[PDB]
Design a protein around this ligand. Structure first.
Ligand code: ATP
Ligand code: ATP
Ligand code: ATP
Ligand code: K
Ligand code: K
Ligand code: K
Ligand code: MG
Ligand code: MG
Ligand code: MG
Lengths: 524, 524, 524
């Protein structure tokens, strides 16, 4: 279609105005005294959120050039959310400050490319300084503090996330889901448990609980669908001779084979239960091999070479306990070699490193959590769905922040880390004066998060920023209590990964944005 | 016509928005780093001004409630200009700050009447504290500093005004008018000189200069129009017998009498000049009596009792020198009793105290300046008419500020005096908590002038305000040099009358404005 | 009415856009290769002009803020036209360059007041440097060159103006009026000649020419209206006894006195002519006294003291020749004392110095030209009225430029003088860096006239400006021939007053304009 074209100051002013609209919508949420934003939904009730990425995503402007600026700056929050799952508001505030100061420098006649180069150099040095300033976050107290800060000073969320991390260890997988009550609950499942119930309700050994309970049972892992009993007959004879129970994880058991297994279960000759193999094609075999390694057994398939008829007792896996319910099956203390389990876990880790998808890598992380460590589910407790959504967003932010803190350490919160980093970079210089001004605007923008936090408290950002800059180390401003002190001591910890990602993404987008001389958009 | 009626928060928000429009237009001019405002004129070129009263006068808003707020707050600048001729921008900034904080308090549910009472109490205490803090401004250096500060750091204007004040003394009258050259000129006329030229060009004793020059002449003061020579004949005979020149200040000389005076002037029998009596009905007699007192003579009139025929040499006044030009007549060193001159000056001062009009009181002040002291005219030098208007406005501001400083003393400039006064009133309390909040909002608004001055410099108002508050006495912030120091030492002096008037008028208007619950205006 | 208020960058951009509209309309006329502008007239034919003041006056913009900028910058051209009668386009180009560079500096964050101070300091130093660089323009060749350059390389206009200046001398008065033919004519009248014809056609001594010619006649100067012959009778008897002719310059001769003068003229007893006294009340007496001084006579009036009855031959004036036509009367070689004539001329010069009106001062300048020197009229020759208007404007520009060159000297034309002055001011510095930038923008704007002259030629302004700057002295660029050389040698002379006035007025308006932060205008 026909295009509206704007140049120089007018285009830059409109882009800055759109950026300011989005950033003003987002910055009101920053900090302990940050407020909430209501986002209208065409289908459903409005959403109340403190997450700056949601606010940024909902922002779209009528003016095409202002909307261009808003959409360009929305990428900062989107990338911060995709990478660190937190710091999106800080990223947006940083991007807005960089854009404002860089456009001021451009209006002063300096070369925008050199300003962008100076910003990039300052941010690279800043990332190095943040890495130097980061301290490890390994104790449960620090993890709880990080979760509490990320959950908007919600101590319960931080304590729950720290407890979940302790229960599931380093290799465990933690997810957040909706709850039914008003209180947040933590459900931790250890060892292996897959969402595959019994193939027949008649298998239930314990009627009062409706769950098959097998003590020290054999494990028959079949990678092929089973419909007849001829293939499985010798295994059943061997199991009955042994006298121990049997659990058959198969692709599908149905028809005559299921029926005769049921009759044999009541007749007491063999206490046998059958469950479906978890997963689907090209992934079900992986879980079957994982269960075989955990239980010290072997998978029966056409591709591997042997058939179910020739399966023996040594072929079958071994486990201390097995519990089957209507939906899930749990194998407790599988009798398998620890070295093989560790090797398979390392192989899955290597595939995760080779993985290029978030969903896939999460699936193999869950597989690792089943093989070693545990799986935790945090059920968010709330009275209404709007409160559920807000609290779940905060809990997800806290979970992401705790993971980032465990991975890359922690720094002083409340924008103090960026203050200290910018103070450490006062002597940084570029190739020319324009690059020096770019470095200076990056350093000044590094103070924007603390200033916005203070402004959201109703205090004077300049006075508090000067007081924090006059301090050293982890000295800073507790905005919740409006008091100065050591941010590590008061538990205001920011994940180093979150701060670094916010700075990097804001810098990239804003440095590209300050170099713009012409905008081309659709005519109104 | 039909009326739009608004209540409570909506009306107050619209009023505050209009106030903010006017105050934002006006505050950009505040301080040494204040900028200029262009005001469009329907007939003529646009006017560039730094005077906040002009900007406030030009402001009128489309929205009727916003316009109501703007018009109400315009009264602050108008009253400051009418009273002190300076501080209108400071008055407007103070009024805006009081309105903003008082509306914040009203939105918090406190009684607006009690807030207004607290504001009034705080401002009364503030005026008392300003009176206590004021130091006399009598030396020429302090007067020049006040004029320089009021003229936007124009040292030449301050020095010129100090020189004019020194030349014309305490009782002299100084006016400002347009000039012809590019430089500001000072024209000081001492003793008595009235804008009445000779009644005939033939009276000129000195053709090379075109001015009658009479050395030790007699003075004939006639309060009646003269057309014949019979009434004036014996006076002419006595003057010719004496041999000294004669100057006739009359209501009007014309016809035969003027002709025979002309012939006698060339014939050398009597060197006589005739001029019109300055002023008009009920005021010309006053100037005639003033000249009679100065020259030790008597006025001839029908009402007093004697006629011109019976006038003698003792009736005539005496002066050392008389110079008549085409437009003005000057009497130098009139031979009159000093005690009578002082008594007449005191009588005119008493009438000035009894006077209730600015134009009238200025007229008798000019009469006093003719009788004693001098009259100074400052011709503003500029290249163009727009520059002439701007510089003349600045020079008028400096003249008003110097007069106010002479009258009521000086305090630290740059909003420092209000800072110190507000600090001295921290313990002030009202009858109830709402009055205490009113006192607090008045004290906080007292910091608005310094904060706006700093903001106009591009610096951080909060940091500089805190630094100034941490100081004591005349410690403050030179915004021109952006350095801290003693404002009296650096010559940043504010007239105490100007600061007090700004505070009082802002307080009155803003305290009345924060009490408004309903607005009634015309429908759009 | 309701007001539209704009702030900062938006207001400044609109003001600059309006300034650019006016300056783009005006700059196309600059220089020898400047084109013409057509200005529409509501009543009458369109006007084709090269004068930048006319173009600036006709400019008015729909957008109120753009119109504000245009009206403000129009003052530069108006003031240059009022002061020097030339250089209005140069003044406008200078003002536009200063505004553009100063707004660039303001957008860079420097203090506009300090930029204005730096501009003013640079322009004061520039005026001093122009005074130093100026050389006197006294020879007829230089005057003709100045007139030719000012008349857009019209050699005939320059030669005619030089001839008029030579004929009327220093004290003569030159005016420009419409002609009847296609060629420019010069009519020079020496001695005294006033536009007052004979009071009766019967006075004509020479019927073939219709003009009274009196050889060595007496001069009777009467300041009163004459209607009877009794008052004038003894003068007539004395004149008839002497036998020489008589010319009566009177307020009015009519009725019986005129009739008997007519009869006596034909009867040959006395060859007498009567003319009306030139001028009106309070000015006719001045011309009568001038004629009396020139002819060595005395004016008869009631105020002076003597009557027409007592007038004698010695009272009457004397002249060598008198020529009366239907409209004008000329007195050739009046027999009067040279010292008295010089004294009266000096007195009129003193009144001119005391005069404060252009029309009045021109009237007394014409009186001086009648008393001493001569009066020249340049009748502009053109085929049509549009060509007449254009050529008359050019001739008026040339006359003003020649007067300015005679008064204050000449400098190198084509913007070279401003180039050299700016080069001489490279070391000039202000109090702070912002004042230094103001000085720099003034110096850069000093190159705008030459650059615009070159651009109007279709050449590269930057290359030619660099070449001229690389030269020294009067080296520069002849744009008419597009060749480099000595501008004085090629006759491209600019009056120093014109260049200085253009720079000063442009500087004042533009320095005030760059300090503007807010504009208030009427809503659309
Ligand atoms: N009590 C506190 N005192 C000072 N700063 C605090 C306090 N609590 C949290 N902060 C700071 O507030 C910031 C976190 O604010 P917030 O969670 O609103 O935004 P975010 O992390 O940038 O983004 P998101 O909207 O994605 O959660 C961090 O810089 C953190 O250090
Ligand atoms: N160099 C300076 N440093 C600090 N403050 C200064 C300086 N020069 C002037 N001021 C302050 O600026 C104020 C005067 O500013 P300005 O003249 O713009 O406004 P005003 O007096 O309120 O009103 P008006 O518009 O009627 O002149 C005073 O408070 C004065 O003390
Ligand atoms: N042949 C030439 N070569 C170079 N410069 C020239 C030449 N002739 C004239 N100029 C220059 O052109 C300028 C005069 O141009 P112009 O008459 O169009 O404008 P102006 O004097 O600024 O204003 P106005 O419109 O009032 O006449 C002067 O600077 C003069 O020196
Ligand atoms: K947030
Ligand atoms: K002001
Ligand atoms: K021109
Ligand atoms: Mg967060
Ligand atoms: Mg002032
Ligand atoms: Mg010209």
């Amino acid at each position: 279609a026909a295009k509206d074209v704007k140049f120089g100051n007018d285009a830059r002013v409109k882009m800055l105005r759109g950026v300011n609209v989005l950033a003003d919508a987002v910055k009101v949420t920053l900090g302990p005294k940050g407020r909430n934003v209501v986002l209208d939904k065409s289908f459903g009730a409005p959403t109340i959120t403190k997450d700056g990425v949601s606010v940024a995503r909902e922002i779209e402007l009528e003016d095409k050039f202002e909307n261009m600026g808003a959409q360009m700056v929305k990428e900062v929050a989107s990338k911060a959310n995709d990478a660190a799952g937190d710091g999106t508001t800080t990223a947006t505030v940083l991007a807005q400050a960089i854009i404002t100061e860089g456009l001021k420098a451009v209006a002063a006649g300096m070369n925008p490319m050199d300003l962008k180069r100076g910003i990039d150099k300052a941010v690279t040095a800043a990332v190095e300084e943040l890495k130097a300033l980061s301290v490890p976050c390994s104790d449960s107290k620090a993890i709880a503090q990080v979760g509490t800060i990320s959950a908007n000073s919600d101590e319960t969320v931080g304590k729950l996330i720290a407890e979940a991390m302790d229960k599931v260890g380093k290799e465990g997988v933690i997810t957040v889901e909706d709850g039914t009550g008003l209180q947040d609950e933590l459900d931790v499942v250890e060892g292996m448990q897959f969402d595959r119930g019994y193939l027949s309700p008649y298998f239930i050994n314990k009627p009062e609980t409706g769950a098959v309970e097998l003590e020290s049972p054999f494990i028959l892992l079949a990678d092929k669908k089973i419909s007849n009993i001829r293939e499985m007959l010798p295994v059943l004879e061997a199991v009955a001779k042994a006298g121990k129970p049997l659990l058959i994880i198969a692709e599908d058991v149905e028809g005559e084979a299921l029926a005769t297994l049921v009759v044999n279960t009541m007749r007491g000759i063999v206490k046998v239960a059958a469950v479906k193999a978890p997963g689907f094609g090209d992934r079900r075999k992986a879980m079957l091999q994982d269960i075989a390694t955990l239980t010290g057994g072997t998978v029966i398939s056409e591709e591997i070479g042997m058939e179910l008829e020739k399966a023996t007792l040594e072929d079958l896996g071994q486990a201390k306990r097995v519990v089957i319910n209507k939906d899930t099956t749990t194998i407790i203390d599988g009798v398998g070699e620890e070295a093989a389990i560790q090797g398979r876990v390392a192989q899955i880790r290597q595939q995760i490193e080779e993985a290029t998808s978030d969903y896939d890598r999460e699936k193999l992380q869950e597989r690792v959590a089943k093989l070693a460590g545990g799986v935790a589910v945090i059920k968010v407790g709330a009275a209404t769905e709007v409160e559920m959504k807000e609290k779940k967003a905060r809990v997800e932010d806290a979970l992401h922040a705790t993971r980032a803190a465990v991975e890359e350490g922690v720094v002083a919160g409340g924008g103090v880390a960026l203050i200290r980093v910018a103070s450490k970079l006062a002597d940084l210089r570029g190739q020319n004066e324009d690059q020096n001004v770019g470095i200076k605007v990056a350093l000044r923008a590094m103070e924007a998060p603390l200033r916005q936090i203070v402004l959201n408290c109703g205090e004077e950002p300049s006075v508090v920023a000067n007081t924090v800059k006059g301090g050293d180390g982890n000295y800073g401003y507790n905005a919740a209590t409006e008091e100065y002190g050591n941010m590590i001591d008061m538990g205001i910890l920011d994940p180093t990964k979150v701060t670094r990602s916010a700075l990097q993404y804001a810098a990239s987008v804003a440095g590209l944005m300050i170099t713009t001389e012409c905008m081309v958009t659709d005519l109104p």
